[PDB]
Design an enzyme around this catalytic site. Structure first.
Site, PDB file in Angstrom:
ATOM      1  N   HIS A 209       2.250  14.487  -1.192  1.00  0.00           N
ATOM      2  CA  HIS A 209       2.799  14.377   0.164  1.00  0.00           C
ATOM      3  C   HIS A 209       4.261  14.812   0.199  1.00  0.00           C
ATOM      4  O   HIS A 209       4.673  15.558   1.087  1.00  0.00           O
ATOM      5  CB  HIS A 209       2.702  12.943   0.686  1.00  0.00           C
ATOM      6  CG  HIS A 209       1.308  12.488   0.977  1.00  0.00           C
ATOM      7  ND1 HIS A 209       0.508  13.093   1.923  1.00  0.00           N
ATOM      8  CD2 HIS A 209       0.581  11.464   0.471  1.00  0.00           C
ATOM      9  CE1 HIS A 209      -0.656  12.471   1.975  1.00  0.00           C
ATOM     10  NE2 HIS A 209      -0.637  11.479   1.103  1.00  0.00           N
TER      11      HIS A 209
ATOM     12  N   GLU B 271      -3.566  14.903   2.425  1.00  0.00           N
ATOM     13  CA  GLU B 271      -4.165  13.982   1.454  1.00  0.00           C
ATOM     14  C   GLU B 271      -4.695  14.679   0.196  1.00  0.00           C
ATOM     15  O   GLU B 271      -4.826  14.048  -0.859  1.00  0.00           O
ATOM     16  CB  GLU B 271      -5.285  13.160   2.112  1.00  0.00           C
ATOM     17  CG  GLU B 271      -4.841  12.311   3.306  1.00  0.00           C
ATOM     18  CD  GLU B 271      -3.696  11.365   2.973  1.00  0.00           C
ATOM     19  OE1 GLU B 271      -3.641  10.864   1.830  1.00  0.00           O
ATOM     20  OE2 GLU B 271      -2.848  11.121   3.854  1.00  0.00           O
TER      21      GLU B 271
ATOM     22  N   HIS C   1      -0.732  11.529  -6.293  1.00  0.00           N
ATOM     23  CA  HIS C   1      -1.180  11.610  -4.901  1.00  0.00           C
ATOM     24  C   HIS C   1       0.008  11.575  -3.935  1.00  0.00           C
ATOM     25  O   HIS C   1       0.135  12.443  -3.069  1.00  0.00           O
ATOM     26  CB  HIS C   1      -2.169  10.485  -4.567  1.00  0.00           C
ATOM     27  CG  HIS C   1      -2.576  10.452  -3.125  1.00  0.00           C
ATOM     28  ND1 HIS C   1      -3.718  11.064  -2.660  1.00  0.00           N
ATOM     29  CD2 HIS C   1      -1.981   9.895  -2.043  1.00  0.00           C
ATOM     30  CE1 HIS C   1      -3.816  10.880  -1.356  1.00  0.00           C
ATOM     31  NE2 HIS C   1      -2.771  10.178  -0.955  1.00  0.00           N
ATOM     32  N   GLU C   2       0.869  10.574  -4.098  1.00  0.00           N
ATOM     33  CA  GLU C   2       2.022  10.385  -3.217  1.00  0.00           C
ATOM     34  C   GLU C   2       3.065  11.484  -3.371  1.00  0.00           C
ATOM     35  O   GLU C   2       3.717  11.868  -2.394  1.00  0.00           O
ATOM     36  CB  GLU C   2       2.653   9.006  -3.433  1.00  0.00           C
ATOM     37  CG  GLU C   2       1.813   7.849  -2.899  1.00  0.00           C
ATOM     38  CD  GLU C   2       1.460   8.010  -1.430  1.00  0.00           C
ATOM     39  OE1 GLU C   2       2.365   8.270  -0.615  1.00  0.00           O
ATOM     40  OE2 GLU C   2       0.273   7.878  -1.090  1.00  0.00           O
TER      41      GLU C   2
ATOM     42  N   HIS D 255      -6.268   0.530   5.939  1.00  0.00           N
ATOM     43  CA  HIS D 255      -6.178   1.588   6.948  1.00  0.00           C
ATOM     44  C   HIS D 255      -6.681   1.152   8.319  1.00  0.00           C
ATOM     45  O   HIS D 255      -6.223   1.664   9.343  1.00  0.00           O
ATOM     46  CB  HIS D 255      -6.935   2.830   6.482  1.00  0.00           C
ATOM     47  CG  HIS D 255      -6.417   3.404   5.200  1.00  0.00           C
ATOM     48  ND1 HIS D 255      -6.562   2.767   3.986  1.00  0.00           N
ATOM     49  CD2 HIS D 255      -5.767   4.563   4.942  1.00  0.00           C
ATOM     50  CE1 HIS D 255      -6.017   3.505   3.037  1.00  0.00           C
ATOM     51  NE2 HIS D 255      -5.528   4.600   3.590  1.00  0.00           N
TER      52      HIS D 255
ATOM     53  N   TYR E 261      -9.558  11.499   4.577  1.00  0.00           N
ATOM     54  CA  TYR E 261      -9.945  11.311   3.179  1.00  0.00           C
ATOM     55  C   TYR E 261     -11.287  11.953   2.847  1.00  0.00           C
ATOM     56  O   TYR E 261     -11.465  12.467   1.743  1.00  0.00           O
ATOM     57  CB  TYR E 261      -9.932   9.830   2.794  1.00  0.00           C
ATOM     58  CG  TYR E 261      -8.564   9.204   2.908  1.00  0.00           C
ATOM     59  CD1 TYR E 261      -7.558   9.500   1.985  1.00  0.00           C
ATOM     60  CD2 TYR E 261      -8.272   8.325   3.945  1.00  0.00           C
ATOM     61  CE1 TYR E 261      -6.296   8.927   2.093  1.00  0.00           C
ATOM     62  CE2 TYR E 261      -7.016   7.749   4.064  1.00  0.00           C
ATOM     63  CZ  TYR E 261      -6.033   8.052   3.137  1.00  0.00           C
ATOM     64  OH  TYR E 261      -4.790   7.475   3.261  1.00  0.00           O
TER      65      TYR E 261
ATOM     66  N   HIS F  78       0.855  -1.186   0.000  1.00  0.00           N
ATOM     67  CA  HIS F  78       0.000   0.000   0.000  1.00  0.00           C
ATOM     68  C   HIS F  78       0.892   1.237   0.000  1.00  0.00           C
ATOM     69  O   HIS F  78       1.722   1.411   0.897  1.00  0.00           O
ATOM     70  CB  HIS F  78      -0.969   0.014   1.186  1.00  0.00           C
ATOM     71  CG  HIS F  78      -2.049   1.045   1.061  1.00  0.00           C
ATOM     72  ND1 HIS F  78      -3.322   0.743   0.625  1.00  0.00           N
ATOM     73  CD2 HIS F  78      -2.040   2.379   1.294  1.00  0.00           C
ATOM     74  CE1 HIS F  78      -4.052   1.844   0.605  1.00  0.00           C
ATOM     75  NE2 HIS F  78      -3.297   2.851   1.004  1.00  0.00           N
ATOM     76  N   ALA F  79       0.721   2.077  -1.020  1.00  0.00           N
ATOM     77  CA  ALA F  79       1.651   3.178  -1.304  1.00  0.00           C
ATOM     78  C   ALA F  79       1.808   4.152  -0.139  1.00  0.00           C
ATOM     79  O   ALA F  79       0.842   4.453   0.565  1.00  0.00           O
ATOM     80  CB  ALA F  79       1.230   3.915  -2.568  1.00  0.00           C
TER      81      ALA F  79
HETATM   82 ZN   LIG Z   1      -2.034   9.947   0.994  1.00  0.00          ZN
END
Ligand SMILES: [Zn+2]
Ligand SMILES: *[C@@H]1O[C@H](CO)[C@@H](O[C@@H]2O[C@H](CO)[C@@H](O[C@@H]3O[C@H](CO[C@H]4O[C@H](CO)[C@@H](O)[C@H](O)[C@@H]4O)[C@@H](O)[C@H](O[C@H]4O[C@H](CO[C@@H]5O[C@H](CO)[C@@H](O)[C@H](O)[C@@H]5O)[C@@H](O)[C@H](O)[C@@H]4O)[C@@H]3O)[C@H](O)[C@H]2NC(C)=O)[C@H](O)[C@H]1NC(C)=O
Ligand SMILES: CC(=O)N[C@@H]1[C@@H](O)[C@H](O)[C@@H](CO)O[C@H]1O
Ligand SMILES: CC(=O)N[C@@H]1[C@@H](O)[C@H](O)[C@@H](CO)O[C@H]1O
Length: 598
Positions: free
Chosen positions: A355, A379, A351-352, A481, A491, A321-322
């Site tokens: 961050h 997020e 998305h990553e 999660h 989220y 999971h990334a």
């Molecule tokens: Zn994230």
């Protein structure tokens, strides 16, 4: 004298922040080693160093009482001290903290190690969620095959960790109360610095809920035409295994069978990515290119040297999971992603990298401020870019979308496709934490824990398991999660505020004008916009130095979390969909599920 002490306090904080960053670096390295390479030895190393840091945090929290910090003039100093008083799990006695760490690693490792047997080949039992099982769930249209993989995964990822999850809930509660919160729910909610936050989200959700019901009804109608009434009823909850996702959280993978206009284009660039010889490296280079095009910070050399961007080809276990990693030095940031060459994965890359950009933007801040304005902000960053990446406008620029005619019908297809990811997700996200909050708050008896989960999934999302479940099963930890103890409300917040950011960034880029038919919100591309990038820089560089409304104000001058932007985005879809459901006499709403026996 308080004047003299406040000068000393500032010096104390400056030194302590630097010490905390350095100590957290060590913990982060051990956690990285474990997540990249799950072994009993690495688990021991990770948990021993965490226990060491927790002990130090205890001493810090105790030392804050030596300063009259609540009496100080500086709001900045007071904010830093307040952050240092909050221990979280580190408030637990030494033995209890060690047990919680053991419990947490047991749950995450279980999830990461899940393997199932092939549906057609009972001797081949090395199918992992990422990528083997997820590929089947997203691609298969054989309802019995889908049901098989659903049951196998939920049994192994969920039910197998019931006892560990129970102990986790107990220790999480004990930790929260040692921090003088009522429960872990309040501990999580404290991150949003707003005592009306839950009610605000209820209000926003209630506004968007009618649109969700229309989408739900239409999807159910279309699924009945594909699978037949023996598989999908008109009036019942949708069997969740048919929705193209293991947790039915986002439905975009079934767009090819539920699209409003099947004879018109539907964006799916995965095939063209493969044809053009895309690699994980190219995808990350393209993400980096997007950020730099907006006059934001380029990825440092440490990122390229140390990141894991492909699933390792040796026999080792890892968390796939990334995740993005901040090592709290200068420019030491990393991503771990088992990336595949698909459209959805292109969004996950962005998305990553969102961050990572946040990490780089606030790395100059004192340690306690080196985090998001609130968890939802962190997020949201990458998702704002992903929204523009998803547009026909952008995908044509990069040659991934060819011979596309953007007429009224194609626009509805694209809006619906986006809604299957963005609107559908809202009730799902809300239920993840509504569930855990109710357990944390002691509102559900242990004998009712499993059906309490499915009751929420029914009430809010109108979905249900493919097979009858009971209190003999325990399905919540089958979601990453939940097994990994990652708060989920972030989220729900993200999916609301990312449209606030997107709308404002698009207006700043000259890409959106509500009175111009040539500039619709759903086709805005913020690539190359320095104006949009400036807004991001102004907000992200703040980190957690100010309460989140001040961070939002830095971006676009607003201070309120609002569902206006997301509703504005989907308004053309809402109009069309309401009419289409009436035209087709589509049943809206669902009866109570029979799939969890109390
Ligand atoms: Zn994230
Ligand atoms: C969560 O909430 C908890 C309460 O539910 C809270 O626990 C309390 O923390 C208090 C510390 O702030 C603590 O108060 C101390 O009490 C000592 C005596 O308590 C004993 O007897 C109690 C029964 O009556 C038992 O229940 C306890 O277990 C103890 O055995 C006092 O000796 C102590 O006093 C000293 O400190 C005060 C504080 O001074 C402050 O700072 C400056 C100092 O320069 C002052 O100028 C300023 O005015 C200010 O008052 C001094 O005034 C005094 O002279 C002494 O030096 C102190 O009052 C309390 O015992 C404890 N438990 C309970 C049940 O109340 C947790 O701290 C909270 N947790 C978090 C994370 O916030
Ligand atoms: C690919 C890789 O880094 N594997 C490591 C291995 O070298 C080491 O022996 C083990 C210790 O538990 O952790 C893992
Ligand atoms: C074209 C453009 O606006 N470039 C900006 C520049 O004006 C600004 O000084 C810099 C600071 O980060 O960011 C970039």
């Amino acid at each position: 004298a308080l004047v003299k002490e406040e000068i000393q306090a500032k010096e104390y904080l400056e030194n302590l922040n630097k010490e905390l960053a350095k100590r957290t670096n060590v913990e982060t390295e051990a956690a990285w080693a474990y997540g990249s390479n799950i072994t009993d030895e690495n688990e021991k190393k990770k948990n021993e160093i965490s226990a060491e840091l927790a002990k130090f945090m205890k001493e810090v929290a105790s030392d804050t009482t030596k300063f009259q910090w609540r009496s100080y003039q500086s709001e900045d100093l007071k904010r830093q001290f307040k952050a240092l008083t909050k221990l979280g799990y580190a408030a637990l006695p030494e033995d209890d903290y060690a047990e919680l760490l053991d419990t947490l690693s047991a749950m995450e490792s279980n999830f990461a190690k899940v393997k199932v047997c092939d549906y057609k080949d009972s001797t081949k039992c090395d199918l992992a969620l990422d990528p083997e099982i997820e590929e089947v769930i997203s691609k298969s249209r054989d309802h019995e095959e889908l049901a098989y993989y659903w049951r196998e995964f939920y049994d192994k990822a969920g039910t197998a960790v019931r006892s560990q999850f129970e102990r986790y809930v107990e220790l999480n509660t004990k930790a929260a109360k040692l921090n003088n919160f009522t429960s872990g729910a309040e501990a999580w909610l404290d991150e949003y610095e707003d005592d009306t936050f839950e009610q605000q989200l209820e209000d926003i959700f209630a506004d968007i809920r009618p649109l969700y019901q229309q989408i739900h009804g239409y999807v159910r109608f279309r699924l009945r035409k594909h699978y037949g009434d023996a598989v999908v009823s008109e009036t019942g909850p949708i069997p969740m295994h048919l929705l193209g996702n293991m947790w039915a959280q986002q439905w975009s993978e079934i767009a090819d069978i539920v699209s409003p206009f099947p004879e018109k284009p539907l964006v799916d660039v995965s095939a063209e990515m493969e044809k053009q010889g895309y690699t994980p490296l190219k995808m990350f280079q393209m993400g980096d290119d997007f950020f730099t095009s907006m006059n934001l910070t380029k990825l440092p050399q440490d990122f390229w040297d140390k990141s894991i961007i492909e699933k390792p080809t040796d026999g080792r276990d890892l968390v796939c999971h990334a995740s993005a990693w901040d090592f709290y030095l200068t420019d030491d940031v990393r991503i771990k992603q088992c990336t595949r060459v698909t459209q959805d994965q292109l969004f996950t890359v962005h998305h990553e990298l969102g961050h990572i950009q946040y990490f780089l933007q606030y790395q100059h801040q004192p340690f306690v401020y080196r985090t998001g304005a609130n968890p939802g902000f962190h997020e949201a960053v990458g998702d704002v870019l992903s929204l523009s990446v998803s547009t026909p406008k952008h995908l044509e620029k990069i040659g991934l979308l060819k011979d596309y005619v953007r007429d009224d019908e194609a626009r509805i297809n694209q809006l619906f496709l986006t809604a299957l990811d963005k609107i559908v997700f809202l009730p799902f996200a809300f239920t993840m934490d509504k569930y855990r909050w109710s357990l944390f708050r002691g509102e559900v008896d242990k004998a009712n824990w499993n059906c309490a989960f499915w009751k929420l999934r029914d009430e809010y999302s109108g979905i249900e398991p493919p097979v009858v479940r009971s209190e003999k099963d325990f399905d919540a930890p089958a979601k990453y999660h939940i097994s990994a103890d990652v708060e989920y409300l972030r989220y729900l917040v993200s999916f609301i505020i990312q449209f606030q950011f997107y709308k404002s960034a698009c207006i700043k880029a000259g890409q959106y004008d509500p009175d111009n038919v040539e500039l619709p919100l759903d086709n805005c591309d913020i690539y190359g916009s320095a104006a949009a990038g400036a807004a991001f820089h102004n907000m992200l560089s703040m980190g957690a130095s100010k309460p989140w409304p001040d961070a939002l104000e830095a971006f676009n001058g607003e201070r309120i979390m609002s569902g206006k932007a997301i509703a504005e985005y989907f308004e053309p879809l809402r109009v069309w969909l309401e009419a289409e459901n009436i035209k087709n006499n589509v049943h809206i709403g669902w009866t109570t599920s029979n799939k969890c026996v109390s």
